[PDB]
């Protein structure tokens, strides 16, 4: 088996290899990648997204999301408070001002220690979820515009024809900037490219042990736990590394820095933090490998999580007998 400590895996492939796609997410697979949840893949020299960033900063924030926390400082949920709309220019500035910028620190296990002692206290701001993209139309090679769309591998899979879109999502983050334990809709793959800026430090619990991290978080946040079967769907809970090794849990951690990308396996839970302004994409995928993780996936009903458009095709065709159910939830 390979792979078997599921170790985080970082991939160099050539110019070559660069090509084709879904046969590099195979390779990786074939390598034990996917035991991890999570895998960084470092582009090869030759390429590129795009000529610049000089030209980024009127792209608009329609909705910025100030992150509040409650709890104590290793297992805390956030709220996201919607703030008046700014621009790109406008969040960097706000990001690098003295009330948001990162601090002061010798490396990134410092600046790490420093967030979870403190980031209870603050309330950064998040420009996530902006549909679009950054990659120029004519980079031909791991353009997360261009990728099959999930409609299609199903399509190609089962032969069933569905309805629905899949596109790209920009993130700007600033220090302290926050993405809760979760998995992908559906147990989906999600690549991540993070185009600008200071890095992005990643957690994730191997696929094989997800349920182990399921179980502690319904032990920690006991009231959400009663009020949903699926509540880390919310997208809402964090729990520090600290608290996942006092906890036996098993989980790997890894810092990406700009100009690489990150890719997250089917149902591979993953959590973490930006380090101080940045600027990725990501979008979802799927492989032949993920249809029984769709079939499987769990779900949200109790009416919070609220997703997307084509997610309801997916689970009228993968799970039938939830529909109903889910649906009611959507409503
Ligand atoms: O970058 C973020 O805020 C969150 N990203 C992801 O969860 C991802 O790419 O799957
Ligand atoms: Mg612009
Ligand atoms: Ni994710
Ligand atoms: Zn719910």
Not at 143 to 151: D, E, K, S
Not at 245 to 257: A, D
Request: aromatic content about 14%; charged content about 25%.
């Amino acid at each position: 088996a390979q792979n078997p400590n599921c170790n985080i895996m970082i991939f160099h492939p050539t110019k070559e290899e660069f090509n084709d796609f879904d046969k590099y997410i195979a390779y990786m697979e074939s390598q034990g990648a996917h035991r991890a949840g999570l895998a960084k893949i470092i582009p090869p020299k030759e390429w590129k997204a795009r000529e610049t960033y000089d030209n980024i900063s009127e792209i608009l924030i329609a909705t910025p999301l100030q992150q509040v926390a409650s709890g104590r400082a290793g297992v805390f949920t956030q709220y996201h408070k919607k703030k008046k709309a700014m621009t790109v220019g406008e969040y960097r500035h706000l990001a690098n001002s003295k009330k948001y910028q990162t601090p002061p620190h010798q490396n990134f296990e410092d600046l790490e220690r420093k967030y979870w002692k403190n980031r209870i206290y603050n309330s950064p701001i998040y420009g996530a979820d902006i549909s679009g993209s950054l990659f120029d139309e004519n980079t031909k090679q791991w353009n997360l515009g261009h990728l099959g769309t999930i409609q299609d591998l199903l399509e190609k899979e089962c032969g069933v024809v569905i309805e629905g879109v899949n596109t790209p999502y920009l993130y700007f983050g600033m220090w302290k900037t926050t993405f809760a334990w979760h998995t992908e809709d559906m147990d989906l793959y999600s690549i991540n490219y993070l185009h600008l800026g200071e890095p992005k430090t990643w957690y994730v619990v191997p696929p094989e042990h997800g349920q182990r991290l399921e179980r502690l978080a319904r032990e920690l946040f006991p009231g959400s736990s009663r009020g949903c079967g699926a509540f880390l769907r919310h997208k809402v809970a964090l729990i520090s590394p600290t608290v996942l090794k006092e906890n036996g849990i098993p989980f790997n951690r890894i810092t990406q820095e700009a100009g690489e990308f990150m890719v997250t396996f089917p149902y591979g839970y993953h959590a973490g933090f930006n380090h101080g302004f940045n600027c990725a994409e990501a979008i979802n995928f799927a492989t032949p490998r993920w249809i029984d993780y769709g079939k499987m996936a769990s779900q949200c009903s109790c009416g919070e999580a609220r997703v997307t458009f084509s997610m309801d095709a997916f689970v009228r065709i993968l799970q039938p007998e939830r529909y109903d159910l889910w649906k009611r939830g959507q409503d």
